[model samples]
Structures are given as C-alpha cells and as structure tokens.
Target: VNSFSGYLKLTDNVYIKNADIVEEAKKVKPTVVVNAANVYLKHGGGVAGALNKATNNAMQVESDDYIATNGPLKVGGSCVLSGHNLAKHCLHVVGPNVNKGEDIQLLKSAYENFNQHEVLLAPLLSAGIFGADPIHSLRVCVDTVRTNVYLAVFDKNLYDKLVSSFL
Candidate 1:
C-alpha cells in the first residue's frame, strides 16, 4: 500500500513493487509474510535469512519442531508461524531448488497454500539461493497468486528489467 518507485498491477488486489521486504512489511502490515525456504526450513540464506533476523528467528523454532516430527517439508508443502514482526503470520513454503528447473507448479502451490487473507507479502520464490530466473519467477507469482500479493523487489536494475518485460 505504500508508494513505491515501481509498481505492476496483476489484479485488483495483487501488485508488484520495487522495495525492501523488511521496510515494506512494516509499512503495509500485511496479514501474512510468506517466506521461501528449503525442506529443512533453515533460515540461513536469501529471503528466509532476512526474515529470520527480522522476526528474531522465531519461525525457525517452529520449523525445527515441524521437521523433527514430520520430517523435511516436501516440495510444494508449507507451514505457518504466528506473531512474525508486523504481520500476524508467516508462511514457510518449500520451493524446489533452481537445479530442478523452475518448478512453477511448486511455486504456485506454495502461494496457494496460505489461507485467504487481505494482504500477503512474498518474495520471488526460488530466485535467490535457489538460482531461479527473476523474470520467470515473477511471472509464476503473478499468474498463480490471486489474493492481495505484494512482491518485494530488492534490486533497482532487476525491477526495471521486470517492468520492461511484464508491463
């Protein structure tokens, strides 16, 4: 909802913005902030890492418990953590590693896994540590997520490129 340098409207509720995830999370106060992670749910790299630090590693504890009992989350599987900073919840989605060749289905499943909410903040799933193509990644997000989706764009150059390609 905050004014951004770049914006792309996918639907009436969903949009992409060039902004910092952490900063935008505070400003927008989405109902949930979704994080892309591996099956282990370790918050060591990429968006998971940034969000772990932001929420004081609270989600990791819940993820650890989940993994301990239910084993590593399968690709397209997810779990939620409550009381994540400004948002009421955080959804940890197990996205396929980029080596698996951009599993758009898995990415779509992850977004679809969350409960319907007014606003949900999501990073470009599998684009960071997973090594996914940013443009393709954005396309998957735009196509699959129907709820109010707020995509966090961290790089200006990449944002410009995506705007040129999609807008």
Candidate 2:
C-alpha cells in the first residue's frame, strides 16, 4: 500500500516512484521488470532477490542455464528471463563496476538497452554494490527511457535525493 508517484520532464520521461518493484510490477503489469543483476546472474539480493521470490526460484534455474549456454553476462550487458508471476519478462542487466573504474560507458549501455517496451519497471542500476553514483544512474536511466518507466527505489535517501533534484 505504500507508494509515491510523480513525473519528470527529461528529454524522455520518468514516472518515478518509491514503491516496491514487485508490488508495482503487479499493479502495472509492465512489459518487463528490469533487474540490476550481477554478471553471474545470481539472484542474490536487492531487485534481483525480489524477482527471485516472484519467479519461484525460476531465476536461478534459468540463470544457470543461461550462463551454461552463453557464459556469464559481461558488465553492462543484458538478457531476458521469464517473469513468472510478476510480469511478462525479467530483463537481467549488469551494471558497470565503479571499483574497477569502469563506470560511464558501461553504465550508459545498461540503460540504453532499455528501449523496447512501453511499460517497464527498473531500479537505479549500479548505484548499489557496483557503486556508480546514484544521481548518475538516474540521469542515464531517464535519458534512455523511450517508454513509460516506473523507477522504484527502496532506498529512502536515494529516493529523496533523486526526485528532489528531478523536480
């Protein structure tokens, strides 16, 4: 029942929110729920873990198969898996690693690939452990959004920082 919804006028648009991504995916029935995933596609925690539960563990099963078939996803790369109970598809995207000093182009590519859906849900990619600046995540994400993006952030401080500036 908790939520926050607003719109920002980027060159594109960001219909931003402070809702659980899983909950919003249910309410909105997005074409895809984009997970900020590891290169290994491990559904460990954060957005990935949310979908791990929703998919009834189909995440790791498919993820393992995917890795076995195609090798581990490189940073800033992406692939899709069945969304199961959440949406139509789950787009697993790897973000750039800040520690390795590879943050700009890789992070840009992560969001740029988000061009093929009308209703989509996403988190602030790479702003967590991979360590891209949260504001930078917001900027690139909004720029690449050719569709209606409901950006859900669970981190309250980040949520505050982003939208206050977004306005």
Candidate 3:
C-alpha cells in the first residue's frame, strides 16, 4: 500500500476528507500547513499529495496549526482562504488558475509573513492539489522561507529521520 504508515499519526494523516485534520490542527497546533480545496482528482494524478516533515517539524515543535491563506508569511494560494481558522498557519497553493510556473508574488508574501513569525518558528510549505514537483517546490519554498526566517524541508526521508531522532 503506497503509504507511510509511520507518519500517519492522528495528527498528520492529512486526507482531504478526513474531518479530523481540523481537530488535529487545533490539538497539535501546526506552524507549517498544507491545504487542498475545490479540486477533483481523476485517475492516478487527480489530487495526490503529502506534507513533508521538513515543512511540519517546526509547526510540531511550536504546536501551531498553519492553515492556508493569503498575505505575507503565506505560501499557498487563497484556495482555502476562508478556512484560515482551520489551521494555525493558513496558506494557499497556487493551481491551474495561476498556472504551474513559479509564483514570485505569492512567494514574496510567504517571506514577509514568515519573517514576522521568527519568534514562534518558521512557516511551512503546503502540498497537494497543485501536483507540483516535490523537490523543486520544497526547495524553492525552503529557500524563500529561509531567506527571511528559519525553515526546513518536509520530505519522506526527513520525516523518518526526525521520528527516529526524536522518538
């Protein structure tokens, strides 16, 4: 089964339909957030996605929920903008409406917001719905957030190492 059983805790299961994602956000208080809204996944590549530990470690550390939204310190698009309260750190991941190319404007917002949260911890890179490359998207996201604030990448390997090291 193509799943990371180790990472699917009550907090990080991250299924779009899983109503518990909202509860976990409030309980764990995530700093880095990922979101997918109003999108259809067809076949094998409809809306498959995952949240990296690199992106979520900080949130887990601070116990802050990073929901998706607009404005600086935000990375994802405004897709789930209205659900800002659903997470500690809300962001919007750009999609077909904005094209698959890089989004400098939204990236700038992320930098600004993250810098402001240096005390609480860095922001996170949301995944899913956009179907973008993990390495490239995570790299650019890490670099951008790192520029103004401390940031990390949330990848499968990183997630495993983090768990082994901490737990």
Candidate 4:
C-alpha cells in the first residue's frame, strides 16, 4: 500500500515498473493496453479476466463480436478494440499456453502486432494464470520494439521479488 515506484530495463527502450497497471494505463490515455487472450479471444481469466471485470465486461462483448465475425484467432493473431472502461483502446492478442516452447514467440508476436504507438502498458504475458515465469515473461515484453513500455505489477510479494532482482 505504500507509494513506492521502481524501474527496470529489458532493452534499450523498454522498461518494467513497480506500480498499478490500471492506474498507469490511465495516465497514458489515448494509448492502447495489451490484453493477453486465448484462441477464442476470451478474457475471462488471468490479467485479462480482471481487466474485463474492471471494464464491466465490455471487452468480452467486443471480443465476442469480433470473433463472431472473424472466426477464431490464431495463437499469434491479435485484434484492437475501442476502450470501453479504460485506456483509449485495447489490444487483444492471442497467446500460447504456459510451458509451451513457443509461448515466448507468441508473446513476442503479440507485442509486435500491436497498433502503432510509442509508449504502451502491458502485463507479463503467460505469467499469471498461464503459469509462466514472471521474470522471463517480462523479458519478452521488454524485448518488443517500443519507445517506452510500462509493466504494472500489483502483487506485493512479486513486486518485492522483482525489486530485489535488480538490487
């Protein structure tokens, strides 16, 4: 609950930050935040699930509509939606299952497929419900080609661990 902030670099331009994802996402309004989704574009679990709930499930409806029209999305495919209860827009990217060898690449493609933008906010793909290593997943996020990247970490223990990693 303390107002503490920390920073870590994954690459020359990307960074990971210790803060609230939703709060930081708000700061960068008119920006697109990445939402890791499954093949069916369902956001009912993981960070995506939380985001859906926060937005009153508007994202689910949007995603459902998109899928209904476009069929199922591939592992590396992605779609963007107008922000209903958050940022300016939402980038819904299909990601691979945890422990899958191609998960990292799928995560990488997800970032690469995002709409053009300088600074973007995203969570650690495959890190939570997907059961991927947070540190490693974060590395994938940082490796993306973006001028500035912000990672929102909410868990106190996880935040402390990340902070210690850099110390």
Candidate 5:
C-alpha cells in the first residue's frame, strides 16, 4: 500500500506526520519507536504487531523476556528493549482502554514517557483500538512532544483533520 506523507509542525523540532512509522523509524539511529502496547506487551496485532515485524520479529522475544524479568507493563507505563533492524530501541508503552472507563491522559502520559528521547517515531498513543479521539489525541501529542519526534498518524483524512484542528 502507498502511504501519503505530510506534517503539521508544532515546533522547529516536533511535528505530526501522516506516514508509515516503520519507514520513518528505520531512518534514525539510537531512535526510539513508541509502541501502542497492551498491558502484557504482546505484539500480536495493530501498530505493535507491525513494529514487531519490522524488527524481524525480535520485539516479541524481547518483549517476552522483559515480562519475565520485570513483570507486565502497566497502563501509562513503558519499558525499553534493544532493536535490530528498525530502530536502536523500542519503547513499549501501555495505553488506556476507554471501554474500561480510562481517560485520554493515560494516553497522553504514555506519550510523555519519551519526551526525553531526542529521536522518537510514535503513533497516536491510544487513538486506535484503545479508542481515544484522534484529533484531541493529536492536540495533546503536539503539546507534550518536543525535540526530534515524529507523531505518526492514521486516517488519510487526518492529514486534513490535522490542518482543520489548527484553525
């Protein structure tokens, strides 16, 4: 599938992007790609699944080991693991499930986890299956993320959705 890439700049260093995260992640070194993880850190599907595939499926084995060593990743929390092909490291963050009465800030908090990492390629934290509103999520995303970070987005309409939100 062909992806359309565009950006909504929030800072000289931060912006929201309509593009493929795997493609963007592969281009940076010592870069951290944030995962939209479940509590267990399983990469069975969704963005998590795609990132695992990009890592030669190395993220799964490492994710298993991380659970074995540190315990399950909690909502709004994160952990890091070594990277193979796609990135220097994968930063796994569990987002809230709105079906369970969770709030968007949990997703925002998940985004906050990596503000210290200069290079990050992140998807909208919980806007997918976890169910946060994408435009609100995008607004929070830009407010919290700075430095060299790319906010990977969905919905080709969102490229336009992003522009409309600013007006």
Candidate 6:
C-alpha cells in the first residue's frame, strides 16, 4: 500500500522495504538523531523471519517478538547482553532489560564490533515506560556507562512511515 501510495504522492515509484538506511542517512547526517522504537524483537531469530513476515502480512502484523503456539513470546523476558559485528555503519537498539546484568561490557563489545564494520551511526537502547517514568532505572544504567554516547527518541509512527518508504 505504501509503495503504491508513493507513486501518487511523489509521482515516482519509490521502492520501499529493507532499503539501505545507512545510505539514506549518510546522504546528509541530520543534527537530530532518530530513534525508531516499539519494534517487538522476535526472540532468538534473525532478520529474515521479520522481513518475510512483513511481506507475507503486508506488514499488518508488525510484531517480531517471538510467538510460540503455547504462550507469549519467549524473550529473555527482557533484553539481554547481546553483541554482534554488523556490516552496516551504525548501531540501533530499543532497550535492554534490567535483568541483562552488568551489560556495560556488552555495550563496549558492540562498539568494538562497530569499529570492525566501519559503522557510521550507533544508538544505545534503553528502557522507557510509556505512562510512567523510570528515572531511577535510567540513572542506574547511566552510572554503569563508561563511554561517551548520545541518544534520541523517535516517534514510533514516524519510524513506521520511514521504514515503509524504504520498502
């Protein structure tokens, strides 16, 4: 629907979906960082499943959170200490579960991986309560942080539109 709509909106067909975000952002690094959130991370799976599901469902079901037939998604019940060497030039995340524990090391590991990939952007994921504030929790995480980092929060709806533009 979005790609089709783009033709009418821009009068040119713009291919969206898994578009190279680094390329798009690198064209001009905006002063403001855009943090797209609320994307339910599908537990213990790679990007392929989410991409396939997006195509299959026309993205009607935007959740990537693990869904087993028996019960709710089997997330680590929260974000865990995860690190990976990405091919892209930047890092992005939603938030880490408190239970992840002493994960400052993981953050450092991610930075090291970023250097290997020649990454251009990196965003540390942190938790945010929708209706309530988690100031103390944030403080705890920040206190453990050992490096200089910057973060920004982007509107979820805006992120959706941005993602669809690339599809």
Q: Which candidate is the best by lDDT?
A: 2
Give one digit per residue, the lDDT tens place, for model 2 in 1-167.
Answer: 22334534344457666667887777766768898898889888777887787778887898999899999987878998887777789888888868667756788788776776666678888877767788888888876667666788777787778878863
- Name the runs in model 4 displaced over 4 angstroms: 1-11, 27-30, 99-104
What C-alpha lDDT do the candidate models reach, one value each?
0.74, 0.77, 0.32, 0.69, 0.74, 0.28
Which of the predicted structures, 1 or 3, would earn the higher TM-score when compared with the native?
1
lDDT of 5 by residue, 135-161 (tens): 777677677766566777755687677
RMSD versus native structure for model 4: 4.1
lDDT string for model 1 (1-167, tens) is: 44333557766666778887877777766778888788888989788888777878877787788789888877887877673675777777877787766565677776566436556777877777787788887777767776677788888888788878884
The stretch of ten residues in a row with the least summed lDDT in candidate 5 is: 1-10
Q: Which runs in model 5 stand beyond 4 Å of their true positions?
A: 1-6
Clashing pairs in 4: none
Per-residue lDDT for 156 in model 6?
49
Kindly give the stretch of ten consecutive residues in candidate 4 with the minimal lDDT sum.
1-10
What would the TM-scores of all predictions be? 0.84, 0.85, 0.34, 0.80, 0.85, 0.26
Report the error of model 3 at residue 62, Å.
Answer: 26
Candidate 6 residue lDDT tens string, 21-125? 322333334222222122354322222232223235322233332222223322212222212212211222334344444343333333232232211222333
Model 3 TM-score, 2 decimals: 0.34
Off by over 4 Å in 1: 1-7, 100-105
Alpha-carbon runs more than 4 Å astray in model 3: 1-24, 30-113, 119-126, 147-167
Residues 62-148, candidate 3: write the lDDT tens digits. 222322222222233332222233335543333331335545345444333443333222213323334443334334444454322
Query: By the TM-score metric, which is better: model 1 or model 5?
Result: 5
Question: Model 1 TM-score?
Answer: 0.84
* Clash number by candidate, in order: 0, 0, 33, 0, 0, 8
* Span of 10 residues, lowest total lDDT, candidate 6: 2-11
